[PDB]
Protein backbone atom coordinates (compact mmCIF):
# COMPACT_ATOMS: atom_id res chain seq x y z
CA UNK A 1 0.00 0.00 0.00
CA UNK A 2 3.00 2.27 0.62
CA UNK A 3 1.71 4.13 3.67
CA UNK A 4 4.90 3.45 5.63
CA UNK A 5 7.35 5.79 7.36
CA UNK A 6 10.73 4.42 8.41
CA UNK A 7 12.04 6.12 11.56
CA UNK A 8 14.74 4.20 13.45
CA UNK A 9 17.09 1.64 11.92
CA UNK A 10 16.90 -1.37 14.24
CA UNK A 11 19.34 -3.82 12.69
CA UNK A 12 21.28 -4.60 9.52
CA UNK A 13 22.00 -7.93 7.84
CA UNK A 14 18.66 -6.53 4.16
CA UNK A 15 17.70 -4.25 7.04
CA UNK A 16 15.07 -3.85 9.76
CA UNK A 17 13.39 -0.60 10.81
CA UNK A 18 10.99 0.76 13.41
CA UNK A 19 8.34 2.63 11.44
CA UNK A 20 4.69 3.66 11.38
CA UNK A 21 1.90 2.25 9.21
CA UNK A 22 -0.37 4.92 7.71
CA UNK A 23 0.54 7.49 10.35
CA UNK A 24 -0.62 5.48 13.37
CA UNK A 25 0.09 1.79 13.98
CA UNK A 26 3.72 1.35 15.02
CA UNK A 27 5.27 -1.54 13.10
CA UNK A 28 8.54 -3.27 12.23
CA UNK A 29 9.78 -3.34 8.64
CA UNK A 30 12.25 -5.84 7.18
CA UNK A 31 13.88 -4.88 3.88
CA UNK A 32 15.60 -6.90 1.16
CA UNK A 33 18.68 -5.69 -0.69
CA UNK A 34 18.30 -6.72 -4.35
CA UNK A 35 21.17 -8.99 -5.38
CA UNK A 36 10.28 -13.52 1.38
CA UNK A 37 8.95 -17.06 1.82
CA UNK A 38 8.64 -16.08 5.48
CA UNK A 39 5.64 -13.91 4.59
CA UNK A 40 4.01 -16.83 2.77
CA UNK A 41 4.15 -18.88 5.98
CA UNK A 42 2.95 -16.11 8.29
CA UNK A 43 -0.20 -15.86 6.15
CA UNK A 44 -1.37 -19.28 7.34
CA UNK A 45 0.04 -19.19 10.87
CA UNK A 46 -1.67 -16.82 13.31
CA UNK A 47 -0.97 -17.19 17.03
CA UNK A 48 -0.42 -14.86 19.99
CA UNK A 49 3.07 -16.28 20.58
CA UNK A 50 3.99 -15.89 16.91
CA UNK A 51 5.06 -12.54 15.46
CA UNK A 52 2.14 -11.19 13.43
CA UNK A 53 2.40 -10.41 9.73
CA UNK A 54 0.67 -7.14 8.84
CA UNK A 55 1.36 -6.31 5.19
CA UNK A 56 3.82 -6.57 2.30
CA UNK A 57 5.18 -4.42 -0.53
CA UNK A 58 6.07 -6.78 -3.37
CA UNK A 59 8.19 -4.25 -5.25
CA UNK A 60 11.60 -2.55 -5.17
CA UNK A 61 9.06 -5.96 0.62
CA UNK A 62 9.31 -4.21 2.92
CA UNK A 63 7.77 -6.92 5.09
CA UNK A 64 5.55 -5.22 7.68
CA UNK A 65 4.77 -6.87 11.01
CA UNK A 66 4.25 -6.68 14.76
CA UNK A 67 6.89 -4.53 16.46
CA UNK A 68 8.67 -6.18 19.40
CA UNK A 69 10.24 -3.44 21.51
CA UNK A 70 12.93 -5.57 23.20
CA UNK A 71 14.59 -6.98 20.08
CA UNK A 72 15.80 -10.57 19.84
CA UNK A 73 15.95 -12.88 22.85
CA UNK A 74 19.67 -13.44 22.32
CA UNK A 75 20.38 -9.71 22.61
CA UNK A 76 17.95 -9.51 25.53
CA UNK A 77 19.75 -12.19 27.55
CA UNK A 78 23.20 -10.81 26.69
CA UNK A 79 21.98 -7.29 27.44
CA UNK A 80 21.70 -5.36 30.69
CA UNK A 81 18.61 -7.36 31.68
CA UNK A 82 20.44 -10.69 31.62
CA UNK A 83 21.84 -10.25 35.12
CA UNK A 84 18.40 -9.70 36.68
CA UNK A 85 16.57 -12.62 35.04
CA UNK A 86 16.07 -15.65 37.28
CA UNK A 87 14.69 -19.14 36.68
CA UNK A 88 11.06 -18.00 37.11
CA UNK A 89 11.36 -15.41 34.34
CA UNK A 90 13.43 -17.72 32.13
CA UNK A 91 11.11 -20.71 32.54
CA UNK A 92 8.16 -18.42 31.84
CA UNK A 93 9.76 -17.25 28.59
CA UNK A 94 10.42 -20.89 27.70
CA UNK A 95 6.74 -21.71 28.24
CA UNK A 96 5.63 -18.98 25.83
CA UNK A 97 7.92 -20.31 23.12
CA UNK A 98 6.64 -23.84 23.70
CA UNK A 99 3.12 -22.45 23.30
CA UNK A 100 3.97 -20.94 19.92
CA UNK A 101 5.67 -24.13 18.79
CA UNK A 102 2.71 -26.13 20.08
CA UNK A 103 0.56 -24.19 17.62
CA UNK A 104 3.13 -24.81 14.89
CA UNK A 105 3.06 -28.47 15.90
CA UNK A 106 -0.73 -28.70 15.58
CA UNK A 107 -0.58 -26.94 12.20
CA UNK A 108 1.80 -29.63 10.90
CA UNK A 109 4.55 -27.10 10.16
CA UNK A 110 8.27 -27.11 10.95
CA UNK A 111 10.44 -24.11 11.88
CA UNK A 112 13.85 -25.58 11.03
CA UNK A 113 15.74 -22.82 12.87
CA UNK A 114 14.34 -22.36 16.37
CA UNK A 115 16.80 -20.54 18.64
CA UNK A 116 17.19 -17.45 20.84
CA UNK A 117 18.34 -15.28 17.92
CA UNK A 118 15.02 -16.01 16.20
CA UNK A 119 12.86 -15.27 19.24
CA UNK A 120 11.60 -11.72 19.76
CA UNK A 121 10.75 -10.07 23.07
CA UNK A 122 8.36 -7.28 24.01
CA UNK A 123 7.12 -5.59 27.17
CA UNK A 124 6.31 -7.69 30.23
CA UNK A 125 8.72 -10.40 29.09
CA UNK A 126 6.45 -11.39 26.20
CA UNK A 127 8.26 -13.79 23.85
CA UNK A 128 7.21 -14.82 20.35
CA UNK A 129 8.53 -17.08 17.59
CA UNK A 130 9.76 -15.39 14.40
CA UNK A 131 11.88 -15.99 11.30
CA UNK A 132 9.58 -18.55 9.69
CA UNK A 133 23.59 -24.08 12.52
CA UNK A 134 24.89 -27.48 13.62
CA UNK A 135 24.87 -26.61 17.32
CA UNK A 136 21.11 -25.98 17.20
CA UNK A 137 20.16 -28.58 14.59
CA UNK A 138 19.14 -32.14 15.41
CA UNK A 139 21.57 -34.82 14.13
CA UNK A 140 19.12 -36.48 11.75
CA UNK A 141 18.26 -33.05 10.33
CA UNK A 142 21.82 -31.79 9.86
CA UNK A 143 23.00 -35.13 8.47
CA UNK A 144 20.12 -36.55 6.44
CA UNK A 145 17.75 -33.59 6.19
CA UNK A 146 15.13 -35.26 8.38
CA UNK A 147 13.45 -32.01 9.39
CA UNK A 148 10.35 -32.60 11.51
CA UNK A 149 8.66 -31.01 14.51
CA UNK A 150 10.81 -33.41 16.54
CA UNK A 151 13.95 -31.76 15.18
CA UNK A 152 12.47 -28.47 16.40
CA UNK A 153 12.04 -30.10 19.82
CA UNK A 154 15.77 -30.84 19.80
CA UNK A 155 16.41 -27.19 18.96
CA UNK A 156 14.19 -26.14 21.85
CA UNK A 157 16.40 -28.14 24.20
CA UNK A 158 19.37 -26.11 23.00
CA UNK A 159 17.32 -22.95 23.44
CA UNK A 160 16.78 -23.96 27.07
CA UNK A 161 20.55 -23.95 27.60
CA UNK A 162 20.60 -20.45 26.10
CA UNK A 163 18.03 -19.24 28.64
CA UNK A 164 19.77 -20.85 31.62
CA UNK A 165 23.22 -19.65 30.53
CA UNK A 166 21.75 -16.24 29.70
CA UNK A 167 22.83 -16.07 26.07
CA UNK A 168 26.03 -18.13 25.98
CA UNK A 169 26.78 -20.10 22.82
CA UNK A 170 26.04 -23.86 23.13
CA UNK A 171 28.88 -26.41 23.33
CA UNK A 172 31.37 -23.80 24.60
CA UNK A 173 34.90 -24.40 23.31
CA UNK A 174 33.82 -26.88 20.63
CA UNK A 175 33.73 -26.11 16.91
CA UNK A 176 31.04 -27.35 14.52
CA UNK A 177 33.05 -30.44 13.60
CA UNK A 178 33.71 -31.49 17.20
CA UNK A 179 30.02 -30.91 17.97
CA UNK A 180 29.00 -33.31 15.20
CA UNK A 181 31.52 -35.99 16.14
CA UNK A 182 30.70 -35.67 19.85
CA UNK A 183 26.90 -35.51 19.70
CA UNK A 184 26.89 -38.58 17.45
CA UNK A 185 28.86 -40.48 20.09
CA UNK A 186 26.21 -39.72 22.71
CA UNK A 187 27.66 -36.52 24.15
CA UNK A 188 25.23 -33.97 25.59
CA UNK A 189 25.81 -30.61 27.26
CA UNK A 190 26.06 -30.85 31.08
CA UNK A 191 23.73 -29.24 33.61
CA UNK A 192 24.31 -25.46 33.59
CA UNK A 193 25.47 -23.85 36.87
CA UNK A 194 22.61 -23.33 39.34
CA UNK A 195 20.22 -25.07 36.92
CA UNK A 196 18.04 -27.71 38.61
CA UNK A 197 18.69 -31.22 37.28
CA UNK A 198 14.95 -31.49 36.61
CA UNK A 199 15.24 -28.86 33.88
CA UNK A 200 18.43 -30.38 32.49
CA UNK A 201 16.55 -33.67 32.39
CA UNK A 202 13.95 -31.97 30.20
CA UNK A 203 16.75 -30.88 27.88
CA UNK A 204 18.09 -34.43 27.63
CA UNK A 205 14.59 -35.63 26.76
CA UNK A 206 14.59 -33.11 23.92
CA UNK A 207 17.99 -34.50 22.89
CA UNK A 208 17.06 -38.20 22.72
CA UNK A 209 18.66 -40.07 19.83
CA UNK A 210 15.28 -41.29 18.61
CA UNK A 211 13.12 -38.37 17.40
CA UNK A 212 9.80 -40.07 18.18
CA UNK A 213 10.95 -40.47 21.79
CA UNK A 214 11.37 -36.71 22.29
CA UNK A 215 8.42 -34.92 23.94
CA UNK A 216 5.82 -32.79 22.16
CA UNK A 217 5.65 -29.00 22.45
CA UNK A 218 2.33 -29.60 24.19
CA UNK A 219 4.06 -31.60 26.91
CA UNK A 220 6.84 -29.01 27.03
CA UNK A 221 4.37 -26.15 27.41
CA UNK A 222 2.40 -27.78 30.23
CA UNK A 223 5.58 -28.89 32.00
CA UNK A 224 7.09 -25.39 31.96
CA UNK A 225 3.84 -23.66 32.95
CA UNK A 226 3.59 -25.82 36.08
CA UNK A 227 7.33 -26.08 36.78
CA UNK A 228 7.46 -24.34 40.17
CA UNK A 229 4.47 -26.26 41.56
CA UNK A 230 4.71 -29.82 40.24
CA UNK A 231 8.47 -30.10 39.77
CA UNK A 232 10.42 -27.61 41.91
CA UNK A 233 7.96 -26.42 44.59
CA UNK A 234 10.95 -25.90 46.89
CA UNK A 235 12.81 -23.61 44.49
CA UNK A 236 14.86 -20.81 46.03
CA UNK A 237 16.53 -17.90 44.20
CA UNK A 238 20.30 -18.01 43.70
CA UNK A 239 23.14 -15.76 42.58
CA UNK A 240 22.45 -16.19 38.86
CA UNK A 241 19.33 -18.38 38.63
C1 LIG B 1 7.41 -9.78 10.22
C2 LIG B 1 8.65 -9.02 10.56
C3 LIG B 1 8.83 -7.73 10.07
C4 LIG B 1 9.99 -7.03 10.39
C5 LIG B 1 10.96 -7.62 11.18
C6 LIG B 1 10.77 -8.90 11.67
C7 LIG B 1 11.81 -9.55 12.53
C8 LIG B 1 12.44 -8.59 13.48
N1 LIG B 1 13.77 -8.47 13.58
N2 LIG B 1 14.07 -7.55 14.49
C9 LIG B 1 15.41 -7.18 14.85
C10 LIG B 1 15.65 -7.52 16.28
C11 LIG B 1 15.61 -5.71 14.64
C12 LIG B 1 16.39 -7.93 14.01
C13 LIG B 1 12.93 -7.02 15.03
N3 LIG B 1 12.72 -6.06 15.99
C14 LIG B 1 11.49 -5.70 16.36
N4 LIG B 1 10.40 -6.28 15.80
C15 LIG B 1 10.52 -7.24 14.85
N5 LIG B 1 9.30 -7.78 14.33
C16 LIG B 1 11.83 -7.65 14.42
C17 LIG B 1 9.62 -9.60 11.36
UniProtKB/Swiss-Prot annotation:
Quaternary structure note:
Forms a complex with polyoma virus middle T antigen. Interacts with AFAP-110. Interacts with GJA1 and PXN.
Q: How is it modified after translation?
A: Dephosphorylated at Tyr-235 by PTPRJ. Phosphorylated on Tyr-235 by c-Src kinase (CSK). The phosphorylated form is termed pp60c-src. S-nitrosylation is important for activation of its kinase activity.
Which cysteine pairs are joined by S-S bonds?
none
- What is the organism field in this record? Gallus gallus (Chicken)
Record function comment:
Non-receptor protein tyrosine kinase which is activated following engagement of many different classes of cellular receptors including immune response receptors, integrins and other adhesion receptors, receptor protein tyrosine kinases, G protein-coupled receptors as well as cytokine receptors. Participates in signaling pathways that control a diverse spectrum of biological activities including gene transcription, immune response, cell adhesion, cell cycle progression, apoptosis, migration, and transformation.
| Protein name, entry field | Proto-oncogene tyrosine-protein kinase Src
Q: In which tissues is it expressed?
A: Expressed to high levels, and with a high degree of kinase activity, in certain fully differentiated cells such as neurons, platelets and macrophages. Isoform 1 is widely expressed. Isoform 2 is expressed only in the muscle.
**Which positions bind ATP?**
10-16, 30
Catalytic residues as annotated in Swiss-Prot or TrEMBL: 113
Compartment list: Cell membrane; Mitochondrion inner membrane; Endosome membrane; Nucleus
Q: Which family does the record claim for this protein? A: Belongs to the protein kinase superfamily. Tyr protein kinase family. SRC subfamily.
Q: Which residues are recorded with the post-translational modification S-nitrosocysteine? A: 206
Q: Which residues form the Protein kinase domain?
A: 4-228
Query: Impact of changing residue 206 to A on the protein?
Result: Significant reduction in S-nitrosylation
Sites of Phosphotyrosine modification: 144, 235
